[PDB]
Scaffold this motif. Structure first.
Motif: not given
Lengths: 525, 525, 525
Positions: A72, A75, A196, A251-252, A280, A284, A360, A513, B36, B45-46, B384
């Motif tokens: 925890x 990461x 990206x 796009x993916x 986008x 895009x 924007x 946390x 949590x 990761x947890x 966005x």
């Protein structure tokens, strides 16, 4: 699978015992007097390292609760804060300190929620004071000075870094290259960098570089998503026949196409990479059109123009000098096409900026224009031997990242003294209850921890050093390299304020946390 | 396999220790002040979650009796009550409380059957009082207010939700889509949604979506049952030729055909889904005819018309814009065909509605008509970035489900105060024996459990809070977000009465099952 | 393998410890107040059941002697008595009681064979008295009343059941079918049901139905046995050409042919089933000829007519509407052929009945005639939804089986009070020795056990209830659903005498076996 579930402190305490080790593994590798850690390699000689990030990424506890606590912390600390070497170490040490203090106070019987509220209040006040006292760097003289400071006093590295920043701009894109000479030089070329990264984590061309590298690569661009879509083999026909590699921007990519490409890269290792689109919607589409014009290709969307992946042609696709892909970042350098077409597209973007009025939209058009009109600076770092140019390139990259972080938000006193100047700001805050007061006290105690840790690494007693720094003026701190109270900013001991702010934020979040978690569920061994 | 069999309390007690853990795993994660839970992941990761359904679905005990008790609670609580996040948590906590009280009273010599009778009497009285005091929501301003309340105070989400529910109707079909813009918009298109989910649980197309996604797919419809029936390959011929996907609708698919399709989906993953028929008998035939007309195809029943699965043709099958399939629900959007044929079918449905007189037949024809004349509302949620639009879409779906649940059965005070207003209704009930009186007492005690749990999660003492709520008026409750006694209905702290009623019903059922079970048989380890 | 052998009580006691559990697993699931049992499923959620047969078929002990005792009770109780839900539970409970009493008395020094003789004498006396007490059911009013009673008071189910029984006959053939409508209807068609079940236990077409289902299937008939005989593939040629299934009726199928057909059933699952011939010798030949005429085919015996399995032709085989195959029962519907041929065969059977004089021959010809001249009644049970029609069909089948059992041997008081009325008949019996007297006492004590068990399930004290029933008149018993002493026959609490008699017989047999066994040999673990 069968699970073991622990409630309350009996879990948190376990989790705490999993972070202390990690803290003790990394707390020693911070400061200029950082000690060493011997990582055991199962196949060769043990590695000797004095890097906090590597040590943190190395360890992995055995007990499930301790392991998940350590993971925890790891990461968040490594992912959210990764720019500077001390950026992650400070986060881990501060998080451990805050979590330990919070758990000790909670064991008395205080309210965890109000304690977390007080902790967040104190952290916000400290960050506000830090933003107030962070002096900026906005002049070429100051940029050169901070580049030299971040390069351990190397004059030529600072000079070339400042030259690159002046030539391209604070918002510009700078990379490094092998100089193949005795003197590092600067070049400006046509480039296209977007935010990206690679879609396949296993897609790593350069094993040592943690990066994907290709040169003189053709490029396919399609507005439509090409996830799990076959018939990309026609492109591979010329990709193999013509020795040039290929990059697909979609796009993916996921499912059948991704699995086929990853298997072919793992086994056959063909030179075709793929990434996502930068923009986008209509933005895009416009950005893809701009990139195709900058590379001489075209967007393969079926709408409007009749062009698909079914058939490919050598002059239908675009040509670019070289493609670099890494985490969160990718770039194309030395594109091709009709330069008159480039001028026409630039003029069209200029006229769109003129006619447009929304903030924007104006920002998006400004970014699209500056992607093409401006260039990319490559720092040809050179030297006598390859093993020398490699170390020089690493140092140049470190200095460049540090100076960019400094110019993005400013600089503050280094050596852990940045946070020691925010304790006075904790008197302004007033707590509604006693638990928020205890949270304020916890953050007040934990603000001084990095300075104590640096002093302890240097060997001098931490308490005396921090007391001297607190009682003295607000311009001099402690230098561990020379081991004395010196004027930090002139002596060249500074750190970017972005790193300190991000480290404090991450430590506060992870500590909250770990001090508010109630139920932990872990798979049975 | 060898079995171990336990009788009487010695089994039930074991089962009880199974549910307590589950309750303690989910009791924490209810209320606006929900703590949590750290779910261990064997690969990464947890996970940090504050969702009751996920935590309940995560745990799995080790001992056979405890595991089966926990699974008994899990299955009913998650399956029968799944609309709202707090519905399943309330079900589990209430069920644990009732089961514990019932077991404790039974252990002292009470009659389990005459205890369950009293428990069910009290539950029915409480539900009757709840239905009495449930204020409805039947005006566009009320719908807008409840949508904004369920969207955590988002005004535009409520506005677009109300616009959809007004342009399509309260009983209409609303879905969400990516807007690819900066402002969420509303569209109305031709749709066909029925209540038959996917036949193959391993037919999850979109891994992240828990849903099956296809676009511009042809459709095959046959009245006859096509389970274990081969020669569907001719359809796959054009499904491979034309890259469009295909959806089959039959009476059922099982055996040879299901096995072939599932193995091809697991290994090759071809884009052909299959589902059951919506209607029954004559209604099924008429609905299939309506769907074929709405898609331009025809029903492949051998009776009457001569058409079978042996041979297919591109224009013989119907064409639809998009196929969405999920649990218990499926839909086809933007069908094709002859619009004059659609008008003629609508007119014939109208004339059948005119000539018919039976209430059931009139209702069926009304549903068949509204499935075509009315449209489907798609909420193009935009923003966005991909992450931003994904989070906004999740929030929009949550608000839409909550407001539909609210409009179906009204609203009532949230924050666990809905049940605290039904305790006075327990004085009217009169028990025939003493055991039914003890059951009444058990339900009276367990009615105050969700509010106590929410208060405990917020940190304030539960007993004081529930006593204050009980002794105060019938219009105000306790807000945990602000931690004070406030007027819930105008402050915007409400929950649909359907969720509360279903949670109470499920808890009563599972508690009766766990307090009346006598013999437990479990496989030997 | 090495065997462990136990002699005398040291074995029997072990076996007893293996039946008590089974009894305790089923004794709780009897009576209207039957409790629930939680069966553990290794793959999914635990099953909640209140069926004695399922619970008995579920458990399986671990210790070899206890396991074989439990299996000894299970096999006989389930296989010999499976018509009614309580038919097996009463058997198991009574068998356990008699075995326990017999073992306890034997341990004192009694003679096991004389004890068994006394037990059998008492059982025979009780059964004779029970057959005396049975009230016949021989009028349509009584049929309707018992159908409604066995259907939990459903009036329409009773009405349609009585209609079927009075339209076909008391010993007619009735089946159920999906109505695909809102109102259950009755139909009469041409059928052929005989008492030969499937030859292959693995041959189960309908996984959920515990049955084999096929429609519009051709049929092959051969007098000669086709066990281990190949060249049946010529029939499979047209079975593959024409998508219709196929049913074979022979003397038996075993060895090569059975192995080939079964391996094709598990692996390929072709739609050809096989079964044994109904009759014997001349009767078998005549029945096969009748079946061929009713289906339009011919018997493939090589004697006389020249026809074998080597070559098949589409019109050589017979055509039938549908074939249903289950345990102990198989049946065909809607046969084909020359209707004039059917009339000629019927007239020939009539004239054979006229000329014949032997009682057995007359009975056989009467059965052969009534097979064809009479029809089969199908109950098209319907409803709104499939999950509703399935439950309605299950209830209809339960009521039909119960009313057929009632009409076969009359009815008697339900609720376990039938046996309590046979205790007075034990005074007439006189034992030759003391051991037979002790057996009489054992049966006298065990006659009341089902009433105690039903009362205990209802929660009321068993001893008081049975004492009240014994001391009261012979017309009123105890109703557990209403929990009071009521007049059973009018209130509608009855059970067929066949079920009670069979349960008592099975319990006596198994108890004698478990109390007379001397040597138990079990494989070593």
């Amino acid at each position: 699978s069968a699970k073991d579930v622990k409630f309350g402190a009996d879990a948190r305490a376990l989790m705490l015992q999993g972070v202390d080790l990690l803290a003790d593994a990394v707390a020693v590798t911070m400061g200029p007097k950082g000690r060493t850690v011997i990582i055991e390699q199962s196949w060769g000689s043990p590695k000797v390292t004095k890097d906090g990030v590597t040590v943190a990424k190395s360890i992995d506890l055995k007990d499930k609760y301790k392991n998940i606590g350590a993971k925890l912390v790891q990461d968040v600390a490594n992912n959210t804060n990764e720019e500077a070497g001390d950026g992650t170490t400070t986060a881990t040490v501060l998080a451990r300190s805050i979590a330990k203090e919070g758990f000790e106070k909670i064991s008395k019987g205080a309210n965890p929620v109000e304690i977390r509220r007080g902790v967040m209040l104190a952290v916000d006040a400290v960050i506000a004071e830090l933003k107030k006292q962070s002096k900026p760097v906005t002049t070429p003289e100051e940029i050169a000075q901070v580049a030299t400071i971040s390069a351990n006093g190397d004059k030529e590295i600072g000079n070339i870094i400042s030259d690159a920043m002046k030539k391209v701009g604070r918002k510009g894109v700078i990379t490094v290259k092998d100089g193949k000479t005795l003197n590092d030089e600067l070049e400006i070329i046509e480039g296209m960098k977007f935010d990206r990264g690679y879609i396949s984590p296993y897609f790593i061309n350069t094993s040592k570089g943690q990066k994907c590298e290709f040169q003189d690569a053709y490029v396919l661009l399609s507005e439509k998503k090409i996830s799990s879509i076959q018939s990309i083999v026609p492109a591979l026909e010329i990709a193999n026949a013509h020795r040039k590699p290929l990059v697909i921007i979609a796009e993916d990519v996921d499912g059948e196409a991704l699995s086929t490409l990853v298997l072919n890269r793992l086994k056959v290792g063909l030179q075709v990479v793929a990434v996502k689109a930068p923009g986008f919607g209509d933005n895009r589409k416009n950005q893809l059109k701009d990139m195709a014009i900058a590379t001489g290709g075209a967007v393969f969307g079926e709408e409007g123009l009749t062009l698909n992946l079914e058939d490919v042609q050598p002059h239908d696709l675009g040509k670019v000098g070289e493609v670099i892909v890494t985490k969160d970042d990718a770039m194309l350098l030395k594109g091709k096409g009709d330069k008159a077409q480039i001028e026409k597209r630039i003029q069209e973007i200029i006229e769109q900026l003129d006619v447009t009025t929304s903030e924007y939209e104006k920002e998006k058009l400004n970014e699209r224009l500056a992607k093409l009109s401006d260039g990319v600076a490559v720092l040809k770092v050179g030297g006598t031997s390859d093993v020398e140019v490699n170390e020089k390139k690493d140092r140049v990259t470190d200095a460049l990242n540090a100076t960019r972080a400094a110019v993005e938000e400013g600089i503050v006193l280094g050596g852990g003294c940045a946070l020691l100047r925010c304790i006075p700001a904790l008197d302004s805050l007033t707590p509604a209850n006693e638990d928020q007061k205890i949270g304020i006290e916890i953050i007040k105690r934990t603000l001084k921890i990095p300075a104590m840790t640096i002093a302890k690494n240097a060997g001098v007693e931490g308490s005396l050093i921090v007391e001297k720094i607190m009682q003295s003026s607000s311009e001099v701190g402690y230098d561990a390299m020379a081991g004395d109270f010196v004027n930090m900013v002139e002596k060249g001991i500074i750190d970017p304020t972005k790193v300190v702010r991000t480290a404090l934020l991450d430590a506060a979040g992870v500590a909250s946390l770990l001090t508010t978690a109630e139920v932990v569920v872990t798979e049975i061994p």
